[PDB]
Amino acid sequence: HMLGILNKRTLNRYEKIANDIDAIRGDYENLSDDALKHKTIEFKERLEKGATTDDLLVEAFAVVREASRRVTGMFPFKVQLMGGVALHDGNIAEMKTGEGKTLTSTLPVYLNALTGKGVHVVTVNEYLASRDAEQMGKIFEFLGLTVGLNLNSMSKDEKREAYAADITYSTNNELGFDYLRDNMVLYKEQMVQRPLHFAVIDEVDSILIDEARTPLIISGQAAKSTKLYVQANAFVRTLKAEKDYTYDIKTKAVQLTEEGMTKAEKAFGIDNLFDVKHVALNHHINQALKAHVAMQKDVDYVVEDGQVVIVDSFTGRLMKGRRYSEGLHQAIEAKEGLEIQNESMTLATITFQNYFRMYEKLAGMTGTAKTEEEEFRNIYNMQVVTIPTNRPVVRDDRPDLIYRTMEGKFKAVAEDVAQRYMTGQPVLVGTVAVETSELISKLLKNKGIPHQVLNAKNHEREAQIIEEAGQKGAVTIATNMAGRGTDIKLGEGVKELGGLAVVGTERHESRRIDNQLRGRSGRQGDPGITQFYLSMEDELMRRFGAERTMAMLDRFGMDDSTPIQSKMVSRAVESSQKRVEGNNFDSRKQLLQYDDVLRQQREVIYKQRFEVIDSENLREIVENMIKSSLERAIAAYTPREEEWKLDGLVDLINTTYLDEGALEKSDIFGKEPDEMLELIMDRIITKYNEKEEQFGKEQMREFEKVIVLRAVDSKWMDHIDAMDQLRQGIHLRAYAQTNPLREYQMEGFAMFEHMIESIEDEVAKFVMKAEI
Numbered sequence: 001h002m003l004g005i006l007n008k009r010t011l012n013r014y015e016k017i018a019n020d021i022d023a024i025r026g027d028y029e030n031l032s033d034d035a036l037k038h039k040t041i042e043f044k045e046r047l048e049k050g051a052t053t054d055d056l057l058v059e060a061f062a063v064v065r066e067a068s069r070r071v072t073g074m075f076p077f078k079v080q081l082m083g084g085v086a087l088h089d090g091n092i093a094e095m096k097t098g099e100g101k102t103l104t105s106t107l108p109v110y111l112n113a114l115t116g117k118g119v120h121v122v123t124v125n126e127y128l129a130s131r132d133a134e135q136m137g138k139i140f141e142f143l144g145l146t147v148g149l150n151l152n153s154m155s156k157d158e159k160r161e162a163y164a165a166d167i168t169y170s171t172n173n174e175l176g177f178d179y180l181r182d183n184m185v186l187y188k189e190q191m192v193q194r195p196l197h198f199a200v201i202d203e204v205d206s207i208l209i210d211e212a213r214t215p216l217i218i219s220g221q222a223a224k225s226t227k228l229y230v231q232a233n234a235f236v237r238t239l240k241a242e243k244d245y246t247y248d249i250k251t252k253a254v255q256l257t258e259e260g261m262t263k264a265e266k267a268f269g270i271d272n273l274f275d276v277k278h279v280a281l282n283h284h285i286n287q288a289l290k291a292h293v294a295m296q297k298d299v300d301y302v303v304e305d306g307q308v309v310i311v312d313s314f315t316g317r318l319m320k321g322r323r324y325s326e327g328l329h330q331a332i333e334a335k336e337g338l339e340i341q342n343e344s345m346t347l348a349t350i351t352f353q354n355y356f357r358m359y360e361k362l363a364g365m366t367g368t369a370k371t372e373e374e375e376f377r378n379i380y381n382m383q384v385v386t387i388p389t390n391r392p393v394v395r396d397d398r399p400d401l402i403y404r405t406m407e408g409k410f411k412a413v414a415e416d417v418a419q420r421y422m423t424g425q426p427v428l429v430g431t432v433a434v435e436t437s438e439l440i441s442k443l444l445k446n447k448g449i450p451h452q453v454l455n456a457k458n459h460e461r462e463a464q465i466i467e468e469a470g471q472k473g474a475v476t477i478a479t480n481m482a483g484r485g486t487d488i489k490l491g492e493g494v495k496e497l498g499g500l501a502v503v504g505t506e507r508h509e510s511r512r513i514d515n516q517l518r519g520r521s522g523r524q525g526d527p528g529i530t531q532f533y534l535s536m537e538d539e540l541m542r543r544f545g546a547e548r549t550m551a552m553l554d555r556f557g558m559d560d561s562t563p564i565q566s567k568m569v570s571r572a573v574e575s576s577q578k579r580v581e582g583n584n585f586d587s588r589k590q591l592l593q594y595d596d597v598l599r600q601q602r603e604v605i606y607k608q609r610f611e612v613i614d615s616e617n618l619r620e621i622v623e624n625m626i627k628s629s630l631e632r633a634i635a636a637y638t639p640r641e642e643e644w645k646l647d648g649l650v651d652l653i654n655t656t657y658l659d660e661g662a663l664e665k666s667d668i669f670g671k672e673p674d675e676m677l678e679l680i681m682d683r684i685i686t687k688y689n690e691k692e693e694q695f696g697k698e699q700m701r702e703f704e705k706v707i708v709l710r711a712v713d714s715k716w717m718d719h720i721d722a723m724d725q726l727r728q729g730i731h732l733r734a735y736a737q738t739n740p741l742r743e744y745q746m747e748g749f750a751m752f753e754h755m756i757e758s759i760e761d762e763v764a765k766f767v768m769k770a771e772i
């Protein structure tokens, strides 16, 4: 009291703001709905003036806090206020399961949605994206803000509409795919997305760590060409057994030698086969080579009804649907003289990781992120902020139990479930593979135990099931990816029984996953036990140290009859687990480097491309591309060092820029390249001014606008593909000791040069020649 007011801080940034917001809690306590709502208009004014989101934060969150209470009945605990603050800072709020992560997000979503730039709230699947949007939207609309739901089944129009709302719920995939499409548009107005302001990712460690490199692809409705496969195969019939190519015994590895390499360079009329401009050609020869030397007909595959069918080596049984990849199937189709069925071509591509970084602001939530903090900082520049639970966790996380054989471990799981089932306490068996869920289910049916099995198939159907897993008698086998996001509240008479008993069947590659399973119990403060069963036979127990240890236990005489539960053991296991998590981080880190090569290239091209679409006049640009294109032509024929500059370039110009027979005797001969370039450029300019004004002015700007886009997109496609072929075969271009990364960066840079020149020569011919 008085002794207190006189004393009045060792509180952190979040404990504070949470208290401030709690203080001004009555200044909205009795306000009126219309008045509470008008608060938005107010915040918007102040922001218009000069205030910042940080400024209004304390009040904004107070508004939402009251708003919720009225609209939902829930008054945002103080822990939750701290979470919102963390999110607003562009960081990761780590709130254990059950803490109210969803509601927690409405705080910073609202705040960052006032400037009118839109805010994306991302989820794992449309069910959750639709539920949240549906439930939380009721709060935002209350404070006069429009919530939009962006789904896969929506039309370019209806999408654009939701991407226009203040807030927009969606899923990682849709957001990604829309982005690729907005980047294939012909008219700036065909896009759906607004600049990527700020995204708030739920289940963020799953989206940015686990599914980070998930590829989002837009393939081509049309097909690829087949001419090269033929040429490549025809060529391979030329070569000989040893001085033309090598063939490894153990591995089916096949390589070309200097002779074949020269015979190839000779055969296809090219200086360098390793030249980045011929990556596709070199790749085709390696498959056509593989198809003739490492794939035997009637043993590796068969030819039936004009096709190539993969024979399962030992079972002699055909695998009717599948093909070989990286064009090896087309290589064999060519060899066997069959109809070459070509693959479709990728037109646009991007990973979740490289898509989310296009944003201006990012924030995420998950109950499990601390372990990956470092990665989050370096890649997404986000920090993990651990928000304290609303109530103290009283859940009894018993130490791992180890059996000798899987059968033993699984029998134990059933025994346990049974015992708990008899008392009537709920049980939720966590699993990692659906195959495993079924293993236990069969075991529970042999005991007469009624249960449910979730395999992340139908999310809504499963969500409902889960919601009833806290009820007395319930028994649920859920596969790691099932039920995510649905709170299991305890049924009447359940805490009195011990709360939810969680039973883990294996430790996952990442402790995070094990902790997510643990977290389903001990919700707000509810009682509950978690227990993991493992066997010496599990995948992890055969790893690093785990081996040595289990080796010793085996020699010690351990049986299924009696499990092991030692702090020395359980910690030696924990030691491996960390090591596994170590290397997995090292790999990710390495792959980040390769992924970046194409990433930076894509960001550049898209930017340049958007500029084209968002440009009214394009002639200066096209002219430049022609200049460059041309300078290259002349340089091709004017060796800066039997003959001193032969000439044919003439017909190369009359056939590529001017018209047939427009020049030859004109200023070309003995001259200097420096000269020939400007002379021929004028001819071109009048030739363009002519076509320009003479055949259609506005029609020229659009004649251009199209000819360029098609040029970019066309070459990008080729690039994405050659860039892939290069990566796949970069160990072939790198030397023994050398690290391929460098070689990939270098050639990857060299190919981009190639791709710009290719874009240039195309937009050069087409513009100066063809008519609309």
Ligand SMILES: Nc1ncnc2c1ncn2[C@@H]1O[C@H](COP(=O)(O)OP(=O)(O)O)[C@@H](O)[C@H]1O
Pocket: 073, 074, 075, 076, 077, 080, 095, 096, 097, 098, 099, 100, 101, 102, 103, 104, 485, 486, 487
């Ligand atoms: N401030 C609150 N007051 C009362 N209940 C809340 C509050 N915040 C969240 N909840 C409840 O917590 C449960 C789980 O919420 P959820 O947002 O899904 O959190 P999480 O994602 O961590 O599990 C829901 O039943 C939700 O209604």
Ligand SMILES: [Mg+2]
Pocket: 101, 102, 202, 203, 485
């Ligand atoms: Mg959630």
